[PDB]
């Protein structure tokens, strides 16, 4: 038989699914959730051997350990140990599409383990082995005898081993196949790995056992009363003496208990379930669960003799909460949710797809620290510990079946096929059976990108029938089909329709009110955070808030899926698609995270944090209105710091305690601020600070901020009468200006400032020139490649229009000596193949103070694709340590992504002014800057800038950040105008019209002087 | 592997299901339904061997014919050749309830066949083998090599044999298992058999082939326009020159045709199906399909080339009809259906479960001849030919999946189990794929008696998704669960509620108007026709006609499941559960048919015919109001015969053509009749006769009848005053009377008329005594057995009250001589253990004309269960050939089943007064009789009677009809009153209160004389 090429065989001899078991024999240990002696971990060192095919595996390996084998850590992905290559592919299958067949060359991982079993385990009861995650299919032998087979890489596989194990030493033999018919339903946008990547354990259960238990909570109208209903099921001999006691604990206080014998109510004409019981406990004024306040109870389930012999005890954390969709709104405990979510893949730069507690906690700390309240299990059931953590810290979970068939043509070819229903159902049913008790899980998902098939309908109904407590969602086949309770599009824009045939992505605002439509809209995927992205993010959150039935979304995605590789010197670097010899690959498309692989934040993460704020603010005179977006909690760990500053210089500050009811408001009256004499703009800045530590944040954490412009005094005082008059020297090649120790040189052949002198030292390595192009972002490139050009993408439009190779023809270059200054006037035309793209007219005015006033006026042709930027650049000879500016900061910001930025006097070391995006591009811009200080230099005006050791050319010519070499000096980019970054998706033009440079005629002015 | 003990494996290497194929290579042959050279029948003589288990099957059988094996006919059940015993069990499984395991002793049927192929089939193409029916699971080998495995006894299993076939002799090897995990989903109340019981054939398709097609017909508001929609799917190498033409034919006239290349519309973000095409044909004024008028079109699907080379063609019959539920009603072509239905099992007394064309035709003819318009496929998909015949003759079909888990505890144990969804799905999905193109199939059914589980809901949805054309129904778990579009209870009563816990069977009238309920009600099973049954059938049909949303039901059931056995003499006799040594067995519960196994009518059939009439009548003066219950057809093959009779003697008659439109009315004026001068009751009997022969009926067929009482002239003249005078002889022991040669003897100890003489010849072999009991009907017994008494059952109630062994204590016996007569007055008390149950007070009067007038007045105790009858009985010495009577007839009729009966003079041979029920009981009664003639005797009055060679005693002491012997002379049972027979079900008291003998005091009078 070839079971790994048969969608009719998804397992052999596998035990039934169920919620997390520990088989406690003491009820207090169950209650306290302390470790169980009946649940052993088999994690540790195993013997591993790699083979090109299952046929290649030597018959002796079943009976005896192989000498060639190596000792490896388990859990692990065998790609991470370097046995074969991890493959990154986006849509296209890593194998030839020929269901259900896989290549005869199938990388086979032979794991083994010699382990010990106590006599006591074999003298009584049942001894089983649980494999939490095996990718993608595996056969299991024990002591040489075959046990079974199993598929689905993301759910536990369990087998009874009692009749196989002997006292003391035993040996496992797990032959794991990389490819199987299972792989056809596992086509997620991620690294294609394999092996025993989750926990392995041994569970001893009594013969007469708890085989399943469902916990439910239902509520009276105002949620002041609840009935906890627990349905318990058993295996073994049914006897009159059997009972179940379900007790409910709140810390140490037992709030409810119920005891009944077995034998459920009459179900049908043949009776009821004699092997079942339902316990109903009344709970007065229950503490409710939410991501805001994750109140938990502990439910202990005791199977026992009536006379008081505990046979075994299972347990779980209970969260009293209700999820329902009413009148088109998704409600948690009667209140409409606002999903501040992110899509999270299980990824580690070093370990691949093996999850650990430390990492999982770090993710949840960071998510909650950045105002996320939800997470999508994209696109599979997660590690069991994740759901427990979300229960405890507080995050709404979308639990998603392991069904992705994205590379099928058409996408629903398998999911419409009734012969593929058995395999699909197990990915849905065994998910529900495992996780249905977790309070954190609020929504079920039928998978991702598998079109819409009749199998989606059958399964949707199955979950509705089995579990009435949670809405079922699914995006495939149009995101509003009969398979989903929530409209859940991916990358639907706020206002713009993308009306594809059959599966249009309507404006989310437009979608809600289509003829006959009523359901809530929460995007399963939005704001593609690929490279320099997240532009246009605020547009989403303005809409989410304005529209009741727009209840948020899940950002794509959490972490960059980059992997650590090592160079000739042994130095680590972040690698992506293709870097492991893997081909075909979708290159850097695996990196779309708000955080890097090592969990270092991208600059976009702060933009998400600002938008997902839980407190809204308005200003009216001296009164600040604070509005709470919390649904259940009071502002009981919050105060408001406020700061008024004249262009960076602190004027007045104070603290006011935040006392806002959920959905409520607080009017905070500011003290009469004494206005200053000196000119400038007053800036109010408020920050919500948490004075006290929490489970998720430290004392002094900042949860929210906002800024306003207050009064402005425009400067009417002019500089003093100049102490000298600058001299001009004329040559055929050059205009040269001299004043004190300052010197300027304008080349008359080129028409640019080609050198500058402070004292006697050079100041330039490259002349000051106009620049209308940028090192293309990931959103600029889209899907375009050298082999396969996408002409619609921005980068190709600029290339084809000739923007990158257009050369400056000089039209005018003159010098005039004024009464107190010298005036250099120039004009340039940028041309490509007989087409004028840009004209740049400048005046440079240099007076007796030592200041150079540059005035730029640029014309852009209407029929040329809008330029990336409209500015200047040069390579300064200086290399300073610090960058000091008055403008938006501290972090990187761009026109369509600058709401999180605040205007203040910022001071950073040079290296921070560069964002190390793994795929190098235009980066580190700071907008709305009025003054920039770098070493001896000061620039003043109203500009946008970046400043680093790397040129735009080097940036656009390098594919990985580690290959970047610091150039001589410092590359300075000062733009009057910069195009938006986009990011609604990363495969088609996504920069909004209002952030495109399309005015035709642009003006900006800079003053360059020594500070 | 043990593949027959694993629900996860239901097939191995099996091909996809699909509508009926023939791989026609000529388009005209396809249009005309003529045979295809590409479809060979492998029916005929096979080689067969039997084994106790699969382990017992010798390994040589795979490549070599076993010498011990026999030559048998296939299709066949191996129980029918006597290899082992067929088992009849109703609910309790024929195997130990141990899912998924079956017995180690598992009877194995080894089938083999040596065959040859055409040369060209070896050259090229796809040669598959089709197994239409294998019970219950099998492995297939070809030329020694293993091909595949299959399950589900009631749907075809297909396997490709292309790579297995060779030149010359080829050999198949089929190992058939009686028990399998599939047995758990196949617990229908029926004989449990096994083997290859449906057709075996070979189909040679091209490699580029039509692999699937679906035909849909949708309409405008008035059905004057239709769009026929044909989606066609292909397999093989796609080519640009490939086309599909779907042509529509009305006889030899092409009405619509459509041609297209491959490649359907865009479905999702990955495109459309390149291997598919949908053809849309406009059809003006389509001839519509119904049971009344089965208008059929022919659609031909041609896979051809653009230049005009046919590759292959498929085809089906098309019936333009629309099924929808609107406003609570089931509509067919916009008109509310009235389902005159029956359940039909696939049964034959000799061939077991093998179906033949002749039998299937014989059933449909009889069904249609008895006013049925609908059939339920209880409880499995049928032999392919049943659907074709139903299309062509016109019968509404409920197609039912092969899923019955009746003996589970509780009934839904498997069906609520997600681990049984895979195996369940295939039984539903492969059914729809096979039968969806049939116009006869109006309703899909999810199975029968399997409780209600999540799987039902999931599978319900799957069909609603895949085929919106047809409603989905299912009865399990309370007949109104979320898994049914129709309220479809089994054995719910008209007015009486049976408020069972969890699964009540409400009054069908009450059920409709339950709070919130809107759906239509059609009983999937009603009126249990077990033995002498169908009492209270008219109550259903009155309710069906009055209540729009009561739309009928399916009678249980069509045919007795009795098998032919043979005695040592060689005589055939009808056998039931237990008669093959089968134990546990459910005895006679397999026979619940309106006909015997050989399709001979039970009396109950004529009652079903009468109540399911399509013409309703009312009388007003001399005017008959005839109303058509037809929805679509005009009365175009009908004329009315009206007959007027004075107590049997014809008075006036005539003919009137019926010109009634559907739902229309007609008035027929009767010519003023001769007013009879002589006394008596006038009767009117109208008949609807079909002058012309049809496809389903002979010329002169009677389809409807009705009777009325017209004017009555009561008799006022007294009988001729006689000359002679009866002479009394008194004795201690006897009272005797003489008149002429006629003589009467009254025993003064017993109090009964013990003998009668005419000349020397004596008239009685047993005294004339009171009878209060009957030989218990199947509806009297129910489930009650000797080993397990059901005290609630009617028979047991009588038994316990001592009705059967009560003795006649004589209270009074006096003789008086009158002026012209002798008067014998008696009084008897019936007592069991000191309790007087009955008292009988009689007066016998013998006058000078030799006429004996009996007056009977009975008292029944109120605390005793109501008596089965109140009458007299005796054994006459006479054996005459004829029975001539004036009353209801000619067929057997009972108080709650006498509507089909008609009042007239009836004359039948004696054996016709007996009804040969396989399980004998009270039978052959006729009610409302005013005169009875037998030999020299005549009885007059108003009585109910049966007359046979079998005593009530023998009938109740004899368990099989073939064991009955004719007793000396003739037994006569004249009842003044007879209890209803019942039959709403056959496991609890079902006789309606108005047909129970509960008046406490009863009167009746008979006149006995000798003409
Ligand atoms: Mg498989
Ligand atoms: Mg306790
Ligand atoms: Mg590639
Ligand atoms: Mg603002
Ligand atoms: Mg099986
Ligand atoms: Mg009548
Ligand atoms: Na909202
Ligand atoms: Na991606
Ligand atoms: Na680059
Ligand atoms: Na009706
Ligand atoms: Na039956
Ligand atoms: Na009997």
The 3 state secondary structure assigned to A673-695 is: CCCCCCCEEEEEEEEEEECCCCC
CA angle B215, B217, B222 (to 5 degrees): 175
- If DSSP codes are grouped into helix, strand and coil, which group holds residue B296? coil
Nearest residue in B to A459, CA atom: B458
Q: What is the dihedral of CA A756, A759, A765, A771, to 10 degrees?
A: -40
Strands A225-235 and A242-250: unpaired
Q: How many angstroms separate the CA atoms of B516 and A994, rounded?
A: 54
**Do B26 and B443 contact (CB within 8 A), yes or no?**
no
Bond into A839 cis (ω within 30):
no
Q: How many angstroms separate the CA atoms of B293 and A643, rounded?
A: 88
Q: How many angstroms separate the CA atoms of B259 and A912, rounded?
A: 67
Does the beta-carbon distance from B462 to A452 stay under 8 Å? no
Strand partners, B230: B215, B279
CA angle B218, B224, B229 (to 5 degrees): 25
Structure tokens at B661: 């439109």
Distance of CA A286 to the CA centre of its chain: 34
Distances (CA, A) of A488 to A512, A524, A538: 11, 5, 19
Does the beta-carbon distance from B270 to A502 stay under 8 Å? no
Does the beta-carbon distance from B268 to A502 stay under 8 Å? yes
Half-sphere exposure of B44 (CA within 13 A, CB side): 8
Cα first-last separation, chain B? 82
A613-718 and A719-1011 share one CATH topology? Answer: no
**Do B392 and B290 contact (CB within 8 A), yes or no?**
no
**The CATH number of domain B613-718, selected from 3.40.50.150, 2.60.40.10, 3.60.15.10, 2.60.120.10:** 2.60.40.10
Structure tokens at A914: 């560069």
Strand partners, B1009: B938
DSSP structural state of residue B198: S
Q: Which residue in the block uniquely carries the two structure tokens 């379930």?
A: A273
Distance from residue A707's CA to the centre of ligand 4 (Å): 6
List, in order, residues 6 or more apart from A947 with CB less than 8 Å away: A883, A910, A913, A924, A932, A934, A970, A971, A972, A973
Q: Does A272 touch chain B (CB under 8 A)?
A: yes
**Do B244 and B229 contact (CB within 8 A), yes or no?**
no
Q: How many angstroms separate the CA atoms of A149 and A13, rounded?
A: 7
Chain B residues in contact with A477 by the CB 8 A cut-off are: 267-268
Q: Give the CA radius of gyration of chain B.
A: 33
- If DSSP codes are grouped into helix, strand and coil, which group holds residue B77? coil
List, in order, residues 6 or more apart from B824 with CB less than 8 Å away: B735, B737, B746, B813, B814, B815, B816, B843, B844, B845, B846
H-run or E-run covering B537? helix B537-546
- Which residue, A233, A644, A677, A613, is CA-closest to A433? A233
DSSP structural state of residue B490: B
**Do B435 and B22 contact (CB within 8 A), yes or no?**
no
Strands B615-620 and A309-318: unpaired
Question: Is the sign of the CA dihedral A425, A427, A430, A436 positive or negative?
Answer: negative
Q: How many angstroms separate the CA atoms of A875 and A973, rounded?
A: 9
Q: Which residue in the block uniquely carries the two structure tokens 């919500």?
A: A688
Quickly count: other Cβ atoms within 10 Å of residue B240's Cβ: 9
Q: What is the dihedral of CA A992, A994, A998, A1000, to 10 degrees?
A: 180
DSSP structural state of residue B671: P
Residue A390 φ/ψ, nearest 5 degrees: -60, -40
Q: Does B467 touch chain A (CB under 8 A)?
A: no
Q: How many angstroms separate the CA atoms of A681 and A887, rounded?
A: 12
**Do B656 and B668 contact (CB within 8 A), yes or no?**
yes
Active-site residue, selected from the candidate residues A186, A312, A314, A525: A525
Nearest residue in A to B505, CA atom: A269
Q: How many angstroms separate the CA atoms of B197 and B382, rounded?
A: 12
- If DSSP codes are grouped into helix, strand and coil, which group holds residue A206? coil
Strand partners, A489: none
Q: What is the resolution of this structure in A?
A: 2.7
Q: How many angstroms separate the CA atoms of A387 and A316, rounded?
A: 11
DSSP structural state of residue B182: G
DSSP structural state of residue B961: G
Cα first-last separation, chain A? 81
- If DSSP codes are grouped into helix, strand and coil, which group holds residue B385? helix
Distances (CA, A) of B794 to B3, B162, B861: 48, 64, 16
Q: How many angstroms separate the CA atoms of A115 and A164, rounded?
A: 13
Count Cβ atoms within 10 A of the Cβ of residue A640 and give its class: 0-12 exposed, 13-18 middle, 19 or more buried: buried
Q: Active site includes A698?
A: no
Q: How many angstroms separate the CA atoms of B705 and B617, rounded?
A: 9
Strand partners, A1010: A937
- Which residue, A604, A594, A613, is CA-closest to A706? A613
Q: What is the dihedral of CA A299, A304, A308, A311, to 10 degrees?
A: -100
- Which residue, B575, B694, B666, B21, is CA-closest to B294? B694
**Do A329 and A336 contact (CB within 8 A), yes or no?**
yes
Ligand found nearest the CA of A685: 4
**Do A979 and A997 contact (CB within 8 A), yes or no?**
yes
Q: Does A97 touch chain B (CB under 8 A)?
A: no
Does the beta-carbon distance from A271 to B409 stay under 8 Å? yes
Distance from residue B394's CA to the centre of ligand 10 (Å): 19
- Residues B664-699 as b/e (b if ≥16 CB within 10 A, e otherwise) read eebebebeeeeebeeebbbbbbbbbbbeeeeebbee
Q: Give the CA radius of gyration of chain A.
A: 33
Query: Measured between CA atoms, how close is A409 to chain B, in angstroms?
Result: 6
Ligand found nearest the CA of A301: 2
What residues sit around ligand 5, an ion, with C-beta below 5 angstroms? B 3, 6, 9, 181
**The domain B719-1011: what is its CATH number?**
2.70.98.10
Q: Which residue in the block uniquely carries the two structure tokens 């009272």?
A: B735
Structure tokens at A91: 């849509």
DSSP symbols for A584-619: S--GGGG---SB-TTSPBPTHHHHHHHHT-SEEEEE
Q: How many angstroms separate the CA atoms of A286 and A908, rounded?
A: 50
Q: How many angstroms separate the CA atoms of A457 and B970, rounded?
A: 68
Q: How many angstroms separate the CA atoms of A893 and A926, rounded?
A: 5
Structure tokens at A206: 């009594």
- Which residue, A983, A386, A340, A391, is CA-closest to A703? A340
Q: Active site includes A525?
A: yes
Q: Which residue in the block uniquely carries the two structure tokens 């237990």?
A: B578
**The domain A322-612: what is its CATH number?**
3.20.20.80
Residue B706 φ/ψ, nearest 5 degrees: -160, 150
Q: Does A44 touch chain B (CB under 8 A)?
A: no
Q: How many angstroms separate the CA atoms of B825 and B54, rounded?
A: 77
Nearest residue in A to B479, CA atom: A268
CA angle B707, B643, B632 (to 5 degrees): 65
Q: How many angstroms separate the CA atoms of B916 and B602, rounded?
A: 9
Residue A463 φ/ψ, nearest 5 degrees: -70, -40
Query: Measured between CA atoms, how close is A466 to chain B, in angstroms?
Result: 6
H-run or E-run covering A120? helix A119-123
**Do B411 and B456 contact (CB within 8 A), yes or no?**
no
CA angle A660, A664, A665 (to 5 degrees): 70
Question: Is the sign of the CA dihedral B329, B333, B335, B341 positive or negative?
Answer: negative
Q: Does B468 touch chain A (CB under 8 A)?
A: no
Count Cβ atoms within 10 A of the Cβ of residue A242 and give its class: 0-12 exposed, 13-18 middle, 19 or more buried: buried
Distances (CA, A) of A446 to A255, A398, A425, A455: 36, 10, 10, 10
Residues of B marked active site are found at 449, 525
- Which residue, B659, B985, B943, is CA-closest to B792? B985
Strand partners, A687: A641, A705
- Which residue, B472, B452, B455, B456, is CA-closest to B464? B472
Nearest by CB to A267, from B9, B273, B412: name it: B412
Distance of CA B683 to the CA centre of its chain: 33
H-run or E-run covering B640? strand B639-646
Ligand found nearest the CA of B629: 10
H-run or E-run covering B743? strand B742-747
Structure tokens at B671: 């010519």
List, in order, residues 6 or more apart from B160 with CB less than 8 Å away: B13, B15, B126, B127, B128
**Do A577 and A587 contact (CB within 8 A), yes or no?**
yes
Q: How many angstroms separate the CA atoms of A359 and A347, rounded?
A: 9
Q: Which residue in the block uniquely carries the two structure tokens 């016109």?
A: B394
Residue A939 φ/ψ, nearest 5 degrees: -115, 130
Nearest by CB to B477, from A268, A406, A464: name it: A268
**Do B676 and B682 contact (CB within 8 A), yes or no?**
yes
- Which residue, A591, A568, A376, A381, is CA-closest to A475? A376
CA angle A606, A607, A610 (to 5 degrees): 85
Q: How many angstroms separate the CA atoms of B362 and B373, rounded?
A: 15
Quickly count: other Cβ atoms within 10 Å of residue B517's Cβ: 14
Does the beta-carbon distance from B461 to A466 stay under 8 Å? no
Q: What is the dihedral of CA A596, A601, A606, A607, to 10 degrees?
A: -10
Residue A843 φ/ψ, nearest 5 degrees: -130, 130
Quickly count: other Cβ atoms within 10 Å of residue A617's Cβ: 18
Q: How many angstroms separate the CA atoms of B846 and B820, rounded?
A: 9
Structure tokens at A254: 């037992």
**Do B470 and B442 contact (CB within 8 A), yes or no?**
yes
- Which residue, A610, A626, A606, is CA-closest to A618? A626
Q: Where are the alpha helices (DSSP H) in A444-595?
A: 454-466, 508-511, 537-546
Domain A1-206, CATH homologous superfamily name and number: Galactose-binding domain-like (2.60.120.260)
**Do B688 and B703 contact (CB within 8 A), yes or no?**
yes
Structure tokens at B530: 């077990």
- Which residue, A294, A49, A293, A69, is CA-closest to A175? A49
**Do B137 and B174 contact (CB within 8 A), yes or no?**
no
Distance from residue B625's CA to the centre of ligand 6 (Å): 14
Q: How many angstroms separate the CA atoms of B153 and B403, rounded?
A: 11
Q: How many angstroms separate the CA atoms of A592 and A575, rounded?
A: 14
Q: Helices B454-466 and A454-466 meet at what angle, rounded to 10?
A: 150
H-run or E-run covering B573? strand B572-575
Q: Does B479 touch chain A (CB under 8 A)?
A: no
Does the beta-carbon distance from A410 to B476 stay under 8 Å? no
Q: How many angstroms separate the CA atoms of B677 and A836, rounded?
A: 125
**Do A111 and A363 contact (CB within 8 A), yes or no?**
no
Q: What is the dihedral of CA B3, B9, B12, B18, to 10 degrees?
A: 140
Structure tokens at A165: 């194990």
Q: How many angstroms separate the CA atoms of B638 and B889, rounded?
A: 24
List, in order, residues 6 or more apart from A462 with CB less than 8 Å away: A425, A428, A429, B418, B421, B454, B455, B457, B458
Strand partners, B670: none
- Which residue, B169, B9, B193, B10, is CA-closest to B88? B193
Q: How many angstroms separate the CA atoms of A640 and A626, rounded?
A: 10
- If DSSP codes are grouped into helix, strand and coil, which group holds residue B386? helix
Strands A563-566 and A550-555: unpaired
List, in order, residues 6 or more apart from A664 with CB less than 8 Å away: A627, A628
Chain B residues in contact with A452 by the CB 8 A cut-off are: 268
Q: Does B499 touch chain A (CB under 8 A)?
A: no
**Which among A8, A271, A458 is the top mutation candidate for probing chain B, defined by the most B β-carbons within 10 Å of its own β-carbon?**
A458
Q: How many angstroms separate the CA atoms of A630 and A374, rounded?
A: 14
Count Cβ atoms within 10 A of the Cβ of residue A139 and give its class: 0-12 exposed, 13-18 middle, 19 or more buried: buried
**Do B125 and B98 contact (CB within 8 A), yes or no?**
no
DSSP structural state of residue B8: T
Domains of chain A, residue spans: 1-206, 207-321, 322-612, 613-718, 719-1011
Nearest residue in B to A150, CA atom: B8
Q: Which residue in the block uniquely carries the two structure tokens 């960058």?
A: A883
Q: How many angstroms separate the CA atoms of A655 and A687, rounded?
A: 10
Query: Measured between CA atoms, how close is B983 to chain A, in angstroms?
Result: 20
Distances (CA, A) of B217 to B227, B257, B288, B369: 6, 15, 11, 30
Ligand found nearest the CA of A547: 7
Q: How many angstroms separate the CA atoms of A310 and A298, rounded?
A: 18
List, in order, residues 6 or more apart from B537 with CB less than 8 Å away: B527, B604, B607, B608, B611, B896, B897, B899, B983
Q: In the PDB record, what is the listed experimental method?
A: X-ray
Q: How many angstroms separate the CA atoms of B315 and B19, rounded?
A: 9
Query: Measured between CA atoms, how close is A142 to chain B, in angstroms?
Result: 18
Query: Measured between CA atoms, how close is B433 to chain A, in angstroms?
Result: 10
Q: Which fold has domain B207-321?
A: Immunoglobulin-like (2.60.40)
Residues belonging to chain A: 1011
């Amino acid at each position: 038989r070839r079971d790994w090429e048969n969608p009719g065989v998804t397992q052999l001899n596998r035990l039934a699914a169920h919620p997390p078991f520990a088989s406690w024999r003491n009820s207090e240990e169950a209650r306290t959730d302390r470790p169980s002696q009946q649940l052993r971990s088999l994690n540790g060192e195993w013997r591993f051997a790699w083979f090109p095919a299952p046929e290649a595996v030597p018959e002796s390996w079943l009976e005896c350990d192989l000498p060639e084998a190596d000792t490896v850590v388990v859990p692990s992905n065998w790609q991470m140990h370097g046995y074969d290559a991890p493959i990154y592919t986006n849509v296209t299958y890593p194998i030839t599409v020929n269901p259900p067949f896989v290549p005869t060359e199938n990388p086979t991982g032979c794991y083994s383990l010699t382990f010990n079993v106590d006599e006591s385990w074999l003298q009584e009861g049942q001894t089983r082995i649980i494999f939490d995650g095996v990718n993608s299919a595996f056969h299991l032998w024990c002591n040489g005898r075959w046990v079974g087979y199993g598929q689905d890489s993301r759910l536990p596989s369990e087998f009874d081993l009692s009749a196989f194990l002997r006292a003391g030493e035993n040996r496992l033999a797990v032959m794991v196949l990389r490819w199987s018919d299972g792989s056809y339903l596992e086509d997620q946008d991620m690294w294609r790995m394999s092996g025993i990547f989750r926990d392995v354990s041994l569970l001893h259960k009594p013969t007469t056992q708890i085989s399943d238990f469902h916990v439910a909570t239902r509520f009276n109208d105002d949620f002041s009363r609840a009935v906890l209903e627990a349905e318990v099921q058993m295996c073994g001999e049914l006897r009159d003496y059997l009972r179940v006691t379900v007790s409910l604990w709140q810390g140490e206080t037992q709030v409810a208990s119920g005891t009944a014998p077995f034998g459920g109510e009459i179900i049908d004409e043949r009776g009821g379930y004699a092997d079942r019981v339902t316990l109903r406990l009344n709970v007065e004024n229950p503490k409710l669960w939410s991501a805001e306040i994750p109140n938990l109870y502990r439910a202990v389930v005791e199977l026992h003799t009536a006379d008081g012999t505990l046979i075994e005890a299972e347990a779980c954390d209970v969260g009293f909460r209700e999820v329902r969709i009413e009148n088109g709104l998704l409600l948690l405990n009667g209140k409409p949710l606002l999903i501040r979510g992110v899509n999270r893949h299980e990824h580690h730069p070093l370990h691949g797809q093996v999850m650990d507690e430390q990492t999982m906690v770090q993710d949840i700390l960071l998510m909650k620290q950045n105002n996320f309240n939800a997470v999508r299990c994209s696109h599979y059931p997660n590690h069991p510990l994740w759901y427990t953590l979300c229960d405890r810290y507080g995050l709404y979970v979308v639990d998603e079946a392991n069904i992705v068939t994205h590379g099928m043509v058409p996408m629903n070819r398998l999911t419409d096929d009734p012969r593929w229903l058995p395999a699909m159902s197990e990915r849905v049913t065994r998910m529900v059976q495992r996780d249905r008790n977790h309070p954190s899980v609020i929504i079920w998902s039928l998978g991702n990108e598998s079109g819409h098939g009749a199998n989606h309908d059958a399964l949707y109904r199955w979950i509705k029938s089995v579990d009435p407590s949670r809405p079922v969602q699914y995006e495939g086949g149009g995101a509003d089909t009969t398979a989903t309770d929530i409209i859940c599009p991916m990358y639907a824009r706020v206002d713009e329709d993308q009306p594809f045939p059959a599966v249009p992505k309507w404006s989310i605002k437009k979608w809600l009110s289509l003829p006959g439509e009523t359901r809530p809209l929460i995007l399963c995927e939005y704001a593609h955070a690929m490279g320099n992205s997240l532009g246009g993010f605020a547009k989403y959150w303005q809409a989410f808030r304005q529209y009741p039935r727009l209840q948020g979304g899940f950002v794509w995605d959490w972490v960059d899926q980059s992997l650590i590789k090592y160079d000739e010197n042994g130095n680590p670097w972040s690698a992506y698609g293709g870097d492991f010899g893997d081909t075909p690959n979708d290159r850097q498309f695996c990196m779309n995270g708000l955080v890097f692989a090592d969990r270092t934040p991208h600059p976009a993460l702060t933009e998400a944090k600002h938008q997902q704020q839980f407190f809204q603010f308005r200003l009216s005179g001296q009164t600040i209105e604070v509005t709470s977006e919390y649904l259940f909690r009071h502002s009981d760990n919050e105060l408001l710091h406020w700061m008024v500053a004249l262009d960076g210089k602190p004027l007045a500050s104070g603290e006011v305690p935040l006392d806002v009811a959920p959905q409520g408001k607080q009017l905070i009256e500011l003290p009469e601020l004494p206005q200053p004499e000196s000119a400038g703009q007053l800036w109010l800045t408020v920050r919500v600070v948490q004075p006290n530590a929490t489970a998720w944040s430290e004392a002094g954490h900042i949860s929210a901020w906002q800024q306003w412009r207050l009064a402005e005094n425009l400067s009417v005082t002019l500089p003093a009468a100049s102490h000298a008059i600058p001299h001009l020297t004329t040559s055929e090649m050059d205009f040269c200006i001299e004043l004190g120790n300052k010197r300027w040189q304008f080349n008359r052949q080129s028409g640019f400032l080609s050198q500058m002198w402070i004292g006697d030292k050079k100041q330039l390595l490259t002349p000051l020139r106009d620049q209308f192009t940028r090192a293309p972002l990931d959103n600029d490139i889209g899907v375009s490649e050298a082999t396969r050009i996408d002409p619609n993408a921005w980068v190709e439009r600029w290339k084809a229009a000739g923007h990158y190779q257009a050369e400056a023809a000089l039209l005018q270059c003159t010098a005039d000596t004024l009464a107190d200054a010298v005036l250099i006037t120039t004009a340039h035309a940028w041309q490509h193949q007989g087409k004028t793209l840009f004209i740049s007219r400048k005046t440079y005015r240099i007076d007796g103070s030592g200041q150079m006033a540059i005035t730029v006026d640029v014309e852009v042709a209407s029929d040329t694709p809008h330029p990336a930027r409209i500015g200047l650049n040069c390579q300064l000879a200086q290399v300073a340590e610090r960058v000091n500016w008055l403008g938006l900061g501290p972090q990187e910001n761009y026109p369509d992504r600058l709401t999180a930025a605040c205007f203040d006097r910022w001071d950073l070391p040079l290296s921070d002014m560069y964002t190390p995006y793994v795929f190098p591009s235009e980066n580190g811009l700071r907008c709305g800057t009025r003054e920039l200080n770098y070493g001896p230099h000061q620039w003043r005006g109203d500009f946008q800038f970046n400043i680093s050791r790397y040129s735009q050319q080097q940036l656009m010519e390098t594919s990985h950040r580690h290959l970047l070499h610091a150039e001589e000096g410092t590359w300075l980019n000062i733009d009057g105008f910069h195009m938006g970054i986009g990011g609604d998706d990363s495969w088609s033009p996504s920069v909004s019209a209002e952030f495109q440079l399309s005015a035709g005629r642009y003006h900006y002015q800079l003053v360059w002087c020594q500070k």
